[PDB]
């Protein structure tokens, strides 16, 4: 009576309230981050390989 019935909490009874949140961006933020990291890494690799090809073409002539 004076703990469960008098108390204001209906704990361990309800359970799931359907969880009506669509999707947070926290599940997407690190995925965007590794996307940006891969794009920048590919940019730098493409630029250094083009610079190496241009230097080899200038040295070979």
């Amino acid at each position: 009576k004076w703990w469960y019935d008098k108390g204001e909490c209906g704990a361990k009874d309800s359970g799931s309230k359907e969880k009506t949140s669509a999707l947070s961006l926290s599940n997407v933020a690190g995925v965007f981050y590794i996307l940006v990291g891969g794009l920048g890494l590919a940019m730098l690799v493409a630029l250094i390989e083009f610079c190496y090809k241009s230097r080899a073409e200038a040295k070979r002539m």
């Binding site: 008098k6 209906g10 009874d13 309800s14 590794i34 996307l35 590919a42 493409a46």
Partner: protein, 130 residues
């Protein structure tokens, strides 16, 4: 940028079309470069995980859509606490729920006697408004 920087992806439409083919699962014109293939491998697994998450989240919400039916008994009233319930403020209904012997209806009368704010109404139309 990169395809015209080192072809068949020389145009803006061919680049955007291979970007669309990378965005979906299927696909058209296969590139042959190192950097273009690694851009495709980065973007393509990225959007694959995204559409996998879209599939899983839509499956979750359709699982939610086929969940438990609404309230059909007083045991369903005791099983939940979100949707409130009340009676008229004066009458034999309050005497019935007050002098009840079933512990479920006793917990109902205890909750309706200790609710914040009061669940009781004065008239029937006041209950219809509530």
């Amino acid at each position: 940028l990169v395809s015209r920087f080192s072809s068949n992806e020389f145009g803006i439409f061919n680049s955007l079309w291979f970007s669309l083919g990378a965005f979906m699962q299927q696909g058209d014109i296969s590139p042959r470069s190192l950097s273009g293939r690694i851009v495709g491998g980065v973007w393509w697994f990225f959007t694959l995980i995204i559409i996998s998450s879209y599939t899983a989240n839509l499956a979750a919400f359709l699982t939610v859509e086929r969940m438990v039916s609404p309230i059909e008994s007083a045991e369903d009233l005791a099983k939940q606490t979100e949707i409130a319930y009340g009676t008229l403020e004066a009458g034999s209904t309050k005497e019935f729920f007050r002098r009840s012997k079933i512990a479920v209806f006793e917990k109902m009368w205890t909750y309706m006697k200790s609710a914040e704010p009061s669940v009781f109404v004065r008239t029937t139309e006041e209950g219809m408004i509530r």
